[PDB]
Amino acid sequence: GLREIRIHLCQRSPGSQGVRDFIEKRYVELKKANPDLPILIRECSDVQPKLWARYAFGQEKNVSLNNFSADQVTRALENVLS
Amino acid sequence: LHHAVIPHGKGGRSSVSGIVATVFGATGFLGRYVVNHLGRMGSQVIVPHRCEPYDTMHLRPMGDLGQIIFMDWNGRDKDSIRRAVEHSSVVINLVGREWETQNFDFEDVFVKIPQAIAQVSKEAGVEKFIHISHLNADIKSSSKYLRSKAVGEKEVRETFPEATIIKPAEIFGREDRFLNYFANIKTVKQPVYIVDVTKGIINAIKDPDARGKTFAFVGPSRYLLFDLVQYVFAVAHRTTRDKVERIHTTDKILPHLPGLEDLGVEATPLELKAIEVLRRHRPAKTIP
Amino acid sequence: QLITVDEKLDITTITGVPEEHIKTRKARIFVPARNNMQSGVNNTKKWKMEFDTRERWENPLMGWASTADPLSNLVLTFSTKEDAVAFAEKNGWSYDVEERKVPKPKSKSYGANFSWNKRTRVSTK
Amino acid sequence: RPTVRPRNDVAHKQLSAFGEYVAEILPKYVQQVQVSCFNELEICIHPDGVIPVLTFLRDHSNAQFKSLADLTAVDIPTRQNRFEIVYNLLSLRFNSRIRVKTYTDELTPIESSVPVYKAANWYEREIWDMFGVFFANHPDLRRILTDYGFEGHPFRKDFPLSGYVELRYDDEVKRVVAEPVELAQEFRKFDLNSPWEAFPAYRQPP
Amino acid sequence: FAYDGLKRQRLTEPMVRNEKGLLTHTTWEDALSRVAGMLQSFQGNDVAAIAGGLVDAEALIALKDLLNRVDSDTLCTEEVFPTAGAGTDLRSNYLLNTTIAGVEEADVVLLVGTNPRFEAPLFNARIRKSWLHNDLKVALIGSPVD
Amino acid sequence: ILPGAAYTEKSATYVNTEGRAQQTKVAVTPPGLAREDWKIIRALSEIAGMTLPYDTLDQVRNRLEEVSPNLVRYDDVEGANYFQQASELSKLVNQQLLADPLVPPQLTIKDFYMTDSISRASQTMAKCVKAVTE
Amino acid sequence: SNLTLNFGPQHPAAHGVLRLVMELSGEMVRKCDPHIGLLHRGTEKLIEYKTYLQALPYFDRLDYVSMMCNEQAYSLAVEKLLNIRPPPRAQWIRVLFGEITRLLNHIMAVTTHALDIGAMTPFFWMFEEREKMFEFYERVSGARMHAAYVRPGGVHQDLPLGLMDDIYEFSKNFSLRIDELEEMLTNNRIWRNRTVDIGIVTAEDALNYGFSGVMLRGSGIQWDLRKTQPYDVYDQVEFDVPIGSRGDCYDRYLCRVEEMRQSIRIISQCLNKMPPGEIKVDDAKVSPPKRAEMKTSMESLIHHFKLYTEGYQVPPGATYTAIEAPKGEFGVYLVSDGSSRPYRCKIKAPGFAHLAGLDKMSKGHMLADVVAIIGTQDIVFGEVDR
Amino acid sequence: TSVKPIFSRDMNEAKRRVRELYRAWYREVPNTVHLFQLDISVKQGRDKVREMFKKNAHITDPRVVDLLVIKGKMELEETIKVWKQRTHVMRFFHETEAPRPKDFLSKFYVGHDP
Amino acid sequence: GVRTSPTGEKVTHTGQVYDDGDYRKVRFVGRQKEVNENFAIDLIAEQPVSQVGSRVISCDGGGGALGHPRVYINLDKETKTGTCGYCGLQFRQQ
Ligand SMILES: NC(=O)C1=CN([C@@H]2O[C@H](COP(=O)(O)OP(=O)(O)OC[C@H]3O[C@@H](n4cnc5c(N)ncnc54)[C@H](OP(=O)(O)O)[C@@H]3O)[C@@H](O)[C@H]2O)C=CC1
Numbered sequence A: 001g002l003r004e005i006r007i008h009l010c011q012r013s014p015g016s017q018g019v020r021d022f023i024e025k026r027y028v029e030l031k032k033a034n035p036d037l038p039i040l041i042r043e044c045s046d047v048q049p050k051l052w053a054r055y056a057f058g059q060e061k062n063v064s065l066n067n068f069s070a071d072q073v074t075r076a077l078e079n080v081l082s
Numbered sequence B: 001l002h003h004a005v006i007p008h009g010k011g012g013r014s015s016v017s018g019i020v021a022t023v024f025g026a027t028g029f030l031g032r033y034v035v036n037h038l039g040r041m042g043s044q045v046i047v048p049h050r051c052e053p054y055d056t057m058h059l060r061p062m063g064d065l066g067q068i069i070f071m072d073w074n075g076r077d078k079d080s081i082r083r084a085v086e087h088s089s090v091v092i093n094l095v096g097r098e099w100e101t102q103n104f105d106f107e108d109v110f111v112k113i114p115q116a117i118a119q120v121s122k123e124a125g126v127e128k129f130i131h132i133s134h135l136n137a138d139i140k141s142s143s144k145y146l147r148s149k150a151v152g153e154k155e156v157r158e159t160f161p162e163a164t165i166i167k168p169a170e171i172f173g174r175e176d177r178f179l180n181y182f183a184n185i186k187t188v189k190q191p192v193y194i195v196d197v198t199k200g201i202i203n204a205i206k207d208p209d210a211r212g213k214t215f216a217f218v219g220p221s222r223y224l225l226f227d228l229v230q231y232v233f234a235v236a237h238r239t240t241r242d243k244v245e246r247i248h249t250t251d252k253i254l255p256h257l258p259g260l261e262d263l264g265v266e267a268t269p270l271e272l273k274a275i276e277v278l279r280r281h282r283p284a285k286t287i288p
Numbered sequence C: 001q002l003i004t005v006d007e008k009l010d011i012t013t014i015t016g017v018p019e020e021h022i023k024t025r026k027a028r029i030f031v032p033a034r035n036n037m038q039s040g041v042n043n044t045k046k047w048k049m050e051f052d053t054r055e056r057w058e059n060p061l062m063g064w065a066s067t068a069d070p071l072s073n074l075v076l077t078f079s080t081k082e083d084a085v086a087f088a089e090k091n092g093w094s095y096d097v098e099e100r101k102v103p104k105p106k107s108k109s110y111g112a113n114f115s116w117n118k119r120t121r122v123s124t125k
Numbered sequence D: 001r002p003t004v005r006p007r008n009d010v011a012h013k014q015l016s017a018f019g020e021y022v023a024e025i026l027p028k029y030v031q032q033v034q035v036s037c038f039n040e041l042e043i044c045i046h047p048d049g050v051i052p053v054l055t056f057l058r059d060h061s062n063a064q065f066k067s068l069a070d071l072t073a074v075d076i077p078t079r080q081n082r083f084e085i086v087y088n089l090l091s092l093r094f095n096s097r098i099r100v101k102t103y104t105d106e107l108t109p110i111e112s113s114v115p116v117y118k119a120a121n122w123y124e125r126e127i128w129d130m131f132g133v134f135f136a137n138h139p140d141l142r143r144i145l146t147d148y149g150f151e152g153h154p155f156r157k158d159f160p161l162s163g164y165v166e167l168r169y170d171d172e173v174k175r176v177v178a179e180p181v182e183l184a185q186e187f188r189k190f191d192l193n194s195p196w197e198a199f200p201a202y203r204q205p206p
Numbered sequence E: 001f002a003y004d005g006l007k008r009q010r011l012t013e014p015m016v017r018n019e020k021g022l023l024t025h026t027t028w029e030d031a032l033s034r035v036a037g038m039l040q041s042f043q044g045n046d047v048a049a050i051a052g053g054l055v056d057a058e059a060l061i062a063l064k065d066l067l068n069r070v071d072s073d074t075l076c077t078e079e080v081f082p083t084a085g086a087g088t089d090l091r092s093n094y095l096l097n098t099t100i101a102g103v104e105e106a107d108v109v110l111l112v113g114t115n116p117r118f119e120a121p122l123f124n125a126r127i128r129k130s131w132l133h134n135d136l137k138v139a140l141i142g143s144p145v146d
Numbered sequence F: 001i002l003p004g005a006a007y008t009e010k011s012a013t014y015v016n017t018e019g020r021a022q023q024t025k026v027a028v029t030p031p032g033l034a035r036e037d038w039k040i041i042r043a044l045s046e047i048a049g050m051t052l053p054y055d056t057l058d059q060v061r062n063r064l065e066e067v068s069p070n071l072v073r074y075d076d077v078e079g080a081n082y083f084q085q086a087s088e089l090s091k092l093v094n095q096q097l098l099a100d101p102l103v104p105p106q107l108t109i110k111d112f113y114m115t116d117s118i119s120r121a122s123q124t125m126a127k128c129v130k131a132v133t134e
Numbered sequence G: 001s002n003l004t005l006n007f008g009p010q011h012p013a014a015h016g017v018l019r020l021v022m023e024l025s026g027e028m029v030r031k032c033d034p035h036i037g038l039l040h041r042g043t044e045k046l047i048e049y050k051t052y053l054q055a056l057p058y059f060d061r062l063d064y065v066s067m068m069c070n071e072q073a074y075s076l077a078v079e080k081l082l083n084i085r086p087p088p089r090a091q092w093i094r095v096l097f098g099e100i101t102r103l104l105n106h107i108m109a110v111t112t113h114a115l116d117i118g119a120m121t122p123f124f125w126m127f128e129e130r131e132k133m134f135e136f137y138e139r140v141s142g143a144r145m146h147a148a149y150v151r152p153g154g155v156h157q158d159l160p161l162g163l164m165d166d167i168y169e170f171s172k173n174f175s176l177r178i179d180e181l182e183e184m185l186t187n188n189r190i191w192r193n194r195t196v197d198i199g200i201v202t203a204e205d206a207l208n209y210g211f212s213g214v215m216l217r218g219s220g221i222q223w224d225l226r227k228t229q230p231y232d233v234y235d236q237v238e239f240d241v242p243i244g245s246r247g248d249c250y251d252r253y254l255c256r257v258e259e260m261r262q263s264i265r266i267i268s269q270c271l272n273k274m275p276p277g278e279i280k281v282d283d284a285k286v287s288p289p290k291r292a293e294m295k296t297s298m299e300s301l302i303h304h305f306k307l308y309t310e311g312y313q314v315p316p317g318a319t320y321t322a323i324e325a326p327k328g329e330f331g332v333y334l335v336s337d338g339s340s341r342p343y344r345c346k347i348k349a350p351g352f353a354h355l356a357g358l359d360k361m362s363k364g365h366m367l368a369d370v371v372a373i374i375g376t377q378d379i380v381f382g383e384v385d386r
Numbered sequence H: 001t002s003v004k005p006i007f008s009r010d011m012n013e014a015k016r017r018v019r020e021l022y023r024a025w026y027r028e029v030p031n032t033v034h035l036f037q038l039d040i041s042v043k044q045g046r047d048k049v050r051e052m053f054k055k056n057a058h059i060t061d062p063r064v065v066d067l068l069v070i071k072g073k074m075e076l077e078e079t080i081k082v083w084k085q086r087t088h089v090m091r092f093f094h095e096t097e098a099p100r101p102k103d104f105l106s107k108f109y110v111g112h113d114p
Numbered sequence I: 001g002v003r004t005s006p007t008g009e010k011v012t013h014t015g016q017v018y019d020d021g022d023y024r025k026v027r028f029v030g031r032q033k034e035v036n037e038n039f040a041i042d043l044i045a046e047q048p049v050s051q052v053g054s055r056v057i058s059c060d061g062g063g064g065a066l067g068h069p070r071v072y073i074n075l076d077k078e079t080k081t082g083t084c085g086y087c088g089l090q091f092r093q094q
């Protein structure tokens, strides 16, 4: 089972623009759909954007989102949630 | 733990091991290795001695400043025993003699004295007690030495039930009376190295499991006595009635008792250390 | 005649330092903070390199502070941050650099003590 | 002025003139020439110039620095070449002293000056022992001051004062043994420098 | 001046309960073995942790990782922050986003339910610095503290 | 009870109210048998058969980075955004404001001196409390 | 065949221990390889952790037969970097005790040289004279040997009343003691057989091998730093420099005996020309104030406090300062980085270069001659090893 | 990246000296065990030589290798000429040093050191 | 003002004494614990307060240059004596 989602991105780098666009538009809808799923958004300067998923018993996977579009981010989350 | 005896440092000369040990019989063959190992790691060592202070001088460099404390004591004076063990957390009894004297017989050194030490140690609240017996202790031995070793082994357990009794085979080393004994002049022997015996004693202090147990410290291989004596003469490039009786007792096999392996010590082969002992005097097949 | 060496400079194997005091130490590269008890700034000019603090214990005999750390008193001085970092790198020490803290320039005006309408007016001299 | 050391401008002028003299004759090697306020002349040279410069100062008729007073090294870790090699020479003919300095790092050898001054033999062994500077073509380069098997070069600024190992006699092995150093009382480091500048004349630019 | 508290009431030894129900000194081996035996017997919501106010991040992640390995996510703190809405999803929801130095640039400050003089003395001193030199306007909702 | 280290006795990361990560340094070692806090949990994890994948201060800090990269950007204030998104989510569930007036826990100086385990154990803080009450 | 000499003789000897590895062919010595470092105590590194005052006692313990002369060399180097000047009375005291120290060294050098060659008796006669000179040390400093008396800025304390009279009474009789020593050795045919034409060194070689002091003058080189590069008040006293002609052990022995006579001649002038005044520089940022001032004046107390905790700062710079020590040129290459602790202190021990020349000087000689050659160099391993 | 060589102009030249020094040390061990009357065997001595060589096997700077060989030759000369004593030879084996803990748990129990 | 703890070990003027379970008191067995009996805190308390006329007095510990640095003591407060910070002598304005 899924336990936690973390999204890392940079505040200014173009590589995180797609992730930035996703949080601007899709994040609120996402939070409403999954009210009890911690989706930790953590911005830090000059990091390549990443998606971390934590499953039961501390199993974790990470997916890169560098240069992704807002939809490619949406699909990446759709894959993780299901 | 009292704050003063919490271990500190890196296990060296200036460190604090947390061990406060009274070593009766420290001025002998086994005692000099035990004191050295205790001093190597910064233990407080109380050394009650019967001999002239001149004969304790080799022990002085073994500890940092203040870590070796010397005291006078008498085997038959219990007040002197109490003063020595009053502040210790472990008492190690290495008292013994390979012959009898006018003032002290085998019953004195192997029964009356060990019992007195164990009793005063218990009355003083000492937590740990290490007693050296002998592998071939038996109340049916032709040797009065080995008979007394058995009786004293029983009295120590009765007086100090939590005592750790160690039963080594004949010990060989630079200052032994085994390889040196043969180099100066049926039965199966399993001699054990002095450093292995010393390491096992040190490990019995640090090991809470060793409390209340009896150990048998023996070497790796068993040698027919004849083969052993021939080997010694080869490496060397070449007494009392009781001592002869002991030397001709076959080393008892006691598989029920724990050994050096249980205390994390690897028994040293005789062939590796034979030259070390016998070099100053200038391979036996084992029994599988 | 010269030769060509493209290796990164490393002298760990020819300094005689035990491995324990190369690989497990953490060097700190910094400009020491001004001692707040004094106004002088002359001790905040150079870069410093210290090592991680290790155990000290009380000597049983005297109560003196004993140590087993051979680097406990080692402090090195450097003109620039780059000099310090270069020295740490060739010696194989893992290091942390902290940026120099420079007092921010202030705006001072004795006249502001007597302001007609501002709170900077002092009530005592 | 009773408490102030008097100046000697005559010697300052003489040494300055001779400093230019040496620089004019050895421009291939000389990088800097300075005369201290207490009248000591230093010639800073490229390390390739050790033998030519020393030979010139020994044999030239206007120099004749026949006596090597001292040869030593200084460790300055902040410099790319941390080691400064210092030759202190004396001329009995002209009753004068000169100092010649060059530099090296841990891996760059310096030419042995034993051919110029036989006195250099042991001085260079000591520099090798205490600082780890290698001297090329030295007849017999090896430690001279430290114990046999000693590791490291104790006079380097990054070598700890008490070292890494210490000795004691061990009864079990019946010999002197070497073990990691532990001190009953750690050496107490003192921070002595006043936070106030002492000598304005030596202030460095910000 | 509170550093002298570090010299009193210190925990220096592992302790466990004995037969009488009293804490008694023991070794790291014994104390950790006792805790390990329980951690291997419980799972999920049967294991929880509360983090105090002086805990460090390295300990915080270590404890979270350990409890996650028995599928427990009840990692709590004593200090409450409302989880409604985004909760701790967005850092800006629980940070002083203006920064301490940013007080010196503000022209109005509204303090809601707090006594920064005692909650954050050095932050309150930054407000007074701006109140003094910038003529900052400060308003408070809550008890009329000083 | 597992004796841990105090803030003067470890190299540990703390994030202040503005989100800036800073680290302490070891000034003295922990007293007695006390140990570094993260090392206790790492030691516990191994004995329990759930060994954590980091054995050093640097490695556990690499782990901190995996969970929140800002936690290893020492002395930096990253800056967080998306106030609108947070505001849009706080308007969903409508919680009611209680009638109690806002009273801070600390009204006077006497409440300032003791607030945590260290200051509660401090004899100087006890003298300050006694001074401002008598 | 290969042979190793013993660490030291079987009677009390204070030169230190030496491991001499030798190659022999019959009686003749073919190679000498001194193995030193047996008294290496990292003095030069320890000094870097001391203030300038704290490092001064280390110089007593270098050539520990010439204590105050080593103190003078270090004091002069620091005074030069400090750009200050010790007062005239201190300079005369430093020359006076510098020559008393030369007598102490030359007695030890000559008599232990004789003692190792088998002439035991003069050592006993002349060490009674050394014992009386130890009393002069003790009366000015409170210590018989490591006085720590000469310091940058001057001397620590003024001479006690009555000391100069006692130095005069001692000096009045000393030349007779030298004469008795010369009666035993100078014309003795056994002594001459052990020293004449032994360890010859040419003037050219002596210079290139870094020799100094008597090791140069024995070969005819006319050089003495007290004459050519005078320091303190040596330019104000009259004395002659003894010069050898054969460059061998016997001539060097004669040079040392005559230098003792010249030291008495200098001491005589010092006793008569001693001026009045203060004995340390009247600059309380370098030299601590008087105790009465320290206990009365605010400025004095501060400067006393700072001089004994931080110590005085020395302007940045490097100096090579040398003196004519009893064993030869003794110098310090002292580097100041501007603080109150020296950055680097290299010590130039005259015996270092002299011992490095043992192999050269012993060529073509027999084993027993090696003992004579070591003696003629006058080697103390505190200064060799540092 | 233009530097003055010590002895070898490249790694291949440097590795020749390393092998020559290993040969000299390898042949010396039996004499050392006899001369110093060591209680260790010749195999133990040669294993020690291999371990010391192996620990520097990762170097890629010919100048650093030259210095290592220079120092190794100095060490050999001390041993052959018997300038060393028995204690100096045996210092390679650390016989009186108790084994120091390697794994995390062992270190955790005994102190604070990593 | 020496006093013996319940175990019989004297307490020093600095308050030191090994507690009951401290092994370190084994060093005194067969020997003795060196304790100075002249407690300075008790000895300075026996000195009488000196009555003086002025508001300000100076103390140098006595003996001129053999005492301590000379300091000046304000005696305005009437609730307490002026105490020398070096030697502990007390003064009072009469
Ligand atoms: N060595 C072996 O092969 C074996 C030894 N053991 C046991 O190990 C212990 C010591 O071995 P080892 O050290 O070789 O024996 P040692 O004889 O070498 O040492 C004997 C010790 O006992 C002391 N001692 C002897 N008689 C008396 C006495 N009457 N009163 C007081 N002290 C006395 C001696 O003190 P002093 O120096 O004053 O005489 C000495 O310190 C003994 O108990 C022995 O039985 C057991 C099995 C084998």
Ligand SMILES: [Zn+2]
Pocket (backbone or CB within 6 Å): I059, I060, I061, I062, I068, I084, I085, I086, I087, I088, I089
């Ligand atoms: Zn007073």
